[PDB]
Design an enzyme around this catalytic site. Structure first.
Site, short mmCIF file in Angstrom:
data_model
loop_
_atom_site.label_atom_id
_atom_site.label_comp_id
_atom_site.label_asym_id
_atom_site.label_seq_id
_atom_site.Cartn_x
_atom_site.Cartn_y
_atom_site.Cartn_z
N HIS A 62 52.68 -15.87 -27.65
CA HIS A 62 51.75 -16.47 -26.68
C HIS A 62 50.29 -16.42 -27.17
O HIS A 62 49.52 -17.34 -26.93
CB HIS A 62 51.91 -15.78 -25.32
CG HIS A 62 53.33 -15.71 -24.85
ND1 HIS A 62 53.98 -16.78 -24.28
CD2 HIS A 62 54.22 -14.69 -24.85
CE1 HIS A 62 55.22 -16.43 -23.96
NE2 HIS A 62 55.38 -15.16 -24.30
N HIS A 92 43.03 -9.63 -26.97
CA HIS A 92 43.60 -10.88 -27.39
C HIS A 92 42.65 -11.97 -26.92
O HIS A 92 41.68 -11.70 -26.21
CB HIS A 92 44.99 -11.08 -26.81
CG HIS A 92 44.98 -11.09 -25.31
ND1 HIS A 92 45.02 -9.92 -24.55
CD2 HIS A 92 44.75 -12.10 -24.43
CE1 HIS A 92 44.90 -10.23 -23.27
NE2 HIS A 92 44.73 -11.54 -23.17
N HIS A 94 42.33 -16.29 -25.49
CA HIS A 94 42.92 -17.58 -25.04
C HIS A 94 42.02 -18.66 -25.60
O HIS A 94 40.79 -18.52 -25.51
CB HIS A 94 42.95 -17.67 -23.52
CG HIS A 94 43.70 -16.53 -22.89
ND1 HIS A 94 45.06 -16.59 -22.63
CD2 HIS A 94 43.30 -15.27 -22.57
CE1 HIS A 94 45.44 -15.43 -22.11
NE2 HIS A 94 44.41 -14.60 -22.09
N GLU A 104 39.81 -19.20 -19.85
CA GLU A 104 40.59 -19.08 -18.61
C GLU A 104 39.64 -19.08 -17.40
O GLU A 104 39.75 -19.93 -16.50
CB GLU A 104 41.47 -17.82 -18.68
CG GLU A 104 42.48 -17.88 -19.84
CD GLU A 104 43.71 -17.05 -19.52
OE1 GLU A 104 43.56 -15.82 -19.35
OE2 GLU A 104 44.82 -17.60 -19.42
N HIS A 117 39.81 -11.08 -24.11
CA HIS A 117 40.22 -10.11 -23.10
C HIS A 117 40.41 -8.75 -23.73
O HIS A 117 41.28 -8.56 -24.59
CB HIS A 117 41.53 -10.59 -22.40
CG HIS A 117 41.30 -11.80 -21.51
ND1 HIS A 117 42.30 -12.64 -21.07
CD2 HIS A 117 40.15 -12.28 -20.97
CE1 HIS A 117 41.78 -13.59 -20.31
NE2 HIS A 117 40.47 -13.41 -20.26
N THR A 196 46.72 -12.80 -16.31
CA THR A 196 46.79 -14.24 -16.34
C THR A 196 48.03 -14.80 -17.02
O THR A 196 48.12 -16.03 -17.20
CB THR A 196 45.58 -14.84 -17.02
OG1 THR A 196 45.58 -14.47 -18.40
CG2 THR A 196 44.28 -14.39 -16.35
N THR A 197 48.91 -13.92 -17.49
CA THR A 197 50.20 -14.39 -17.96
C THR A 197 51.27 -13.65 -17.16
O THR A 197 51.02 -12.56 -16.65
CB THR A 197 50.41 -14.11 -19.45
OG1 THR A 197 50.31 -12.71 -19.68
CG2 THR A 197 49.37 -14.80 -20.26
N1 LIG Z 1 45.47 -12.10 -20.14
S1 LIG Z 1 45.33 -10.73 -19.39
O1 LIG Z 1 44.21 -9.95 -19.93
O2 LIG Z 1 45.21 -10.92 -17.94
C1 LIG Z 1 46.69 -9.78 -19.69
C2 LIG Z 1 48.03 -10.12 -19.59
C3 LIG Z 1 48.92 -9.05 -19.89
C4 LIG Z 1 48.28 -7.85 -20.23
S2 LIG Z 1 46.60 -8.15 -20.15
ZN LIG Z 2 44.20 -12.64 -21.56
#
Ligand SMILES: NS(=O)(=O)c1cccs1
Ligand SMILES: [Zn+2]
Ligand SMILES: NS(=O)(=O)c1cccs1
Length: 258
Positions: A62, A92, A94, A104, A117, A196-197
């Site tokens: 992802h 990570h 997006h 996002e 993030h 958000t995933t």
């Molecule tokens: N993209 S996030 O930071 O909301 C996230 C998803 C799963 C662990 S952290």
């Molecule tokens: Zn994220």
């Protein structure tokens, strides 16, 4: 096959396996800068990444995660809206297929080319897997990326991406210093929300920095060469791995600054 970002398993589909997709504190959201209330009672954010220990970088199909050793209090976030201490586990990004999209969160409907993030878990819950089950389990620090000048502190990440091109590859990734990804100011908006995933758990205090970092077109081009598929499967470029803005509903976005 499972959830993803395509027309058949993308964000509009997530609800069928994860009904909390349509809940009351979903992320991301649009940050209406005129409606966010200045809150003089908010503490400055405390980011202490002095002793951070990166271990590994992983393509999970992802995005890619850079993971940190979170078995001691080495890289912590505190202060801001947070009670207690949250440990850095991974970061990570997006991003988009084009510079015109990829973030996002949005700021007055503006989309940034990408969003970082930095994910931290509440030390009182003892580990990540337990924290996500709690309404104040995670604090995610979101930082927007725009395209202009290179960010020198991101280069080490972009250079290792060739080695983790496809789903499931991982590589050693030691002594990466996350402080080289932060903008100058720590001015932020904060609101309560979710992963958000999938599993979209409603366990996050979101801390979204007002100041973007700038990265180069060549840097974000390299994100776009990654793959969603596994090695020796049809090639799907890892792009547009962002969830759009979800309804704000009964929530207020506070700002640390005027
Ligand atoms: N993209 S996030 O930071 O909301 C996230 C998803 C799963 C662990 S952290
Ligand atoms: Zn994220
Ligand atoms: N709801 S979902 O995106 O996880 C999904 C899985 C398979 C087809 S659609």
């Amino acid at each position: 096959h499972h959830w993803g970002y395509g027309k058949h398993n993308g964000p509009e589909h997530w609800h069928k396996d994860f009904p909390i997709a349509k809940g009351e504190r979903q992320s991301p959201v649009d940050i209406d800068t005129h409606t966010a209330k200045y809150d003089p009672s908010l503490k400055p954010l405390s980011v202490s990444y002095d002793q951070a220990t990166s271990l590994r970088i992983l393509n999970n199909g992802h995005a890619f995660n850079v993971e940190f050793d979170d078995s001691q209090d080495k890289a912590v976030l505190k202060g801001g809206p947070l009670d207690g201490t949250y440990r850095l586990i991974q970061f990570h990004f997006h991003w988009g297929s084009l510079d015109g999209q990829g973030s996002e969160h949005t700021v007055d409907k503006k989309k940034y080319a990408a969003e970082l993030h930095l994910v931290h878990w509440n030390t009182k819950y003892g580990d990540f897997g337990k924290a996500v089950q709690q309404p104040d389990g995670l604090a995610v620090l979101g930082i927007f990326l725009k395209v202009g000048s290179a960010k020198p502190g991101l280069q080490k990440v972009v250079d290792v991406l060739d080695s983790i091109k496809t789903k499931g590859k991982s590589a050693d990734f030691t002594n990466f210093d996350p402080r080289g990804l932060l903008p100058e100011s720590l001015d932020y908006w904060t609101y309560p929300g979710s992963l958000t995933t999938p599993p979209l758990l409603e366990c996050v205090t979101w801390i979204v920095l007002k100041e973007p970092i700038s990265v180069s077109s060549e840097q974000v081009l390299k994100f776009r060469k990654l793959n969603f598929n596994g090695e020796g499967e049809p090639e799907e470029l890892m792009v547009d791995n962002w969830r759009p803005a979800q309804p704000l509903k009964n929530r207020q976005i506070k700002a640390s600054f005027k």
